[PDB]
């Protein structure tokens, strides 16, 4: 064993990472960067080993040679004999969510509305909806489709950032890390809940986890699922209990990536760290829970039951799936070979 150097994105992940490192007796230590892209560069340079990534960022890391190691696995819909670590992953449902009270907004009337996105380059947040929209409109001018948005990672003076709010101080508007008030699944959903945006592009789970008292957080504690609808590609609106019939795509789960040459070591260490700090882990909750952060999804989604071994030593293309990979390649033609770095 060597120590594994985790890469934390922004200061709130970094703080979580430091508690993990303390509790692991330095089996894990922490590098931190301002953006996911910057953490991927640290890993490429060998200044960090690994981080957990959305599928759109796996595409970026993968084009640069990093490889998937273990995947987030959340509670299966169906009972399984299989241990979590062995259970195959089931993707998550990317959806578009609006206020029920915003009547008559549908997928087909999104143009010139206000949008909330988890971040540029992320799956449910970006790649799926904007790939869909570019294709449906026949235009690469996706930066002109909504009147204003919060899409963290975009140009802070552009309309794609006009709705983002920055941190407590109002600084770091539109930065793609949890300091941006509207960053990520929970930030984009809060962007909708507070009626900053007309639509949020998130996943099905986000809606459930932040409504009907599932979150105690001040902005979320009062929210009721019935006040929300999903937008279906057929132009219909459904209640959020129907995401299986009204989603934009099924996404590949967030997964850990590292360099090939560190993958087996990163895997071993993680399997052991989750035995200690994961769901039901020997030292969670008394000491530290790797998969909790007060709904802030820091390092890992809060709904992760375990990190699960992958079948078939998949390359990043195999992990993401050919179709998703081709959807991303297609969209990036708007703004098929090389590492972006
Ligand atoms: C947007 O349209 C593109 C361009 O047609 C779609 O790309 C095709 O996807 C199919 C199914 O995976 C492939 O058989 C074709 O080879 C792809 N065409 C090209 C030119 O690459 C893409 O999937 C659509 N995007 C989204 C997000 O649905
Ligand atoms: C959409 O996401 C929600 C939230 O994760 C899912 O509801 C959970 O489903 C599990 C497994 O069925 C239940 O044991 C949980 O108690 C549910 N959580 C809550 C907060 O209600 C829901 O199944 C997902 N829907 C689809 C179609 O995938
Ligand atoms: C539509 C869908 C369902 Cl329903 C389930 C699962 C996936 C999809 N779609 C896609 C899957 C991968 C890549 C691109 C797409 C897309 O067409 O946006
Ligand atoms: C640190 O790692 C070594 C080697 O795997 C092991 O003996 C020890 O259990 C680990 N401790 C923690 C607290 O993760
Ligand atoms: Fe995602
Ligand atoms: Zn589907
Ligand atoms: Zn293979």
From Swiss-Prot:
Positions of disulphide bridges: 7-39, 17-30, 64-339, 84-306, 116-191, 140-334, 150-164, 161-174, 232-246, 284-289
Localization, UniProt: Secreted; Cytoplasmic granule
Residues carrying sugar: 27, 135, 204
Residues that hold hydrogencarbonate 2 according to the record: 118, 122, 124-125
Modification after translation (UniProt): Poly-N-acetyllactosaminic carbohydrate moiety seems to be needed for TLR4 activation.
Stretches assigned to the Transferrin-like domain: 4-333
Binding, Fe(3+) 2: 54, 92, 185, 254
Family that this chain belongs to: Belongs to the transferrin family.
Assembly, per entry: Monomer. Found in a complex with LTF, CLU, EPPIN and SEMG1. Found in a complex with MPO and LTF; interacts directly with CP, allows Fe(3+) incorporation into LTF and activation of CP ferroxidase activity.
Function: Transferrins are iron binding transport proteins which can bind two Fe(3+) ions in association with the binding of an anion, usually bicarbonate.
Name of the protein in its database record: Lactotransferrin
Organism: Bos taurus (Bovine)
Lineage of source species: Eukaryota, Metazoa, Chordata, Craniata, Vertebrata
Gene responsible for this protein: LTF
Shown chain mapped onto the complete sequence: 361 to 705 of 708
């Amino acid at each position: 064993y060597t120590r594994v150097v985790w890469c934390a994105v922004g200061p709130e992940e970094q703080k979580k990472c430091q508690q993990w490192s303390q509790q692991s007796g330095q089996n894990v230590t922490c590098a931190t960067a301002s953006t996911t892209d910057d953490c991927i560069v640290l890993v490429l340079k060998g200044e960090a080993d690994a981080l957990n990534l959305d599928g759109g960022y796996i595409y970026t890391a993968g084009k640069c040679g990093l490889v998937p190691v273990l995947a987030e696995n959340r509670k299966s819909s169906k009972h399984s004999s299989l241990d979590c670590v062995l259970r195959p992953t089931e993707g998550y449902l990317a959806v578009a969510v609006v206020k029920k009270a915003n009547e008559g907004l549908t997928w087909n009337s999104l143009k010139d509305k206000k949008s909330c996105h988890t971040a540029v380059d992320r799956t449910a947040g970006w790649n799926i909806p904007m790939g869909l929209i570019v294709n449906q409109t026949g235009s690469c001018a996706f930066d002109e489709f909504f009147s204003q948005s919060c899409a963290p990672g975009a140009d802070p003076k552009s309309r794609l950032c006009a709705l983002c709010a920055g941190d407590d101080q109002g600084l770091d508007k539109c930065v793609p890390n949890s300091k941006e008030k509207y960053y990520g699944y929970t930030g984009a959903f809060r962007c909708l809940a507070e009626d900053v945006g007309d639509v949020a592009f998130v996943k099905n789970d986000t809606v459930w986890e932040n409504t009907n008292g599932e979150s105690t957080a001040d902005w979320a504690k009062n929210l009721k699922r019935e006040d929300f609808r999903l937008l279906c590609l057929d132009g219909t609106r459904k209640p959020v209990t129907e995401a299986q019939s009204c989603h934009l795509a099924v996404a590949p789960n967030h997964a850990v990536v590292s360099r090939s040459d560190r993958a087996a070591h990163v895997e071993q260490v993680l399997l052991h760290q989750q035995a200690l700090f994961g769901k039901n882990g020997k030292n969670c909750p008394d000491k530290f829970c790797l998969f909790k952060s007060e709904t802030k999804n820091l390092l890992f989604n809060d709904n992760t039951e375990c990190l699960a071994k992958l079948g078939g030593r998949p390359t990043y293309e195999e992990y993401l799936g050919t179709e998703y990979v081709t959807a991303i390649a297609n969209l990036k033609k708007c703004s098929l070979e090389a590492c972006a770095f």
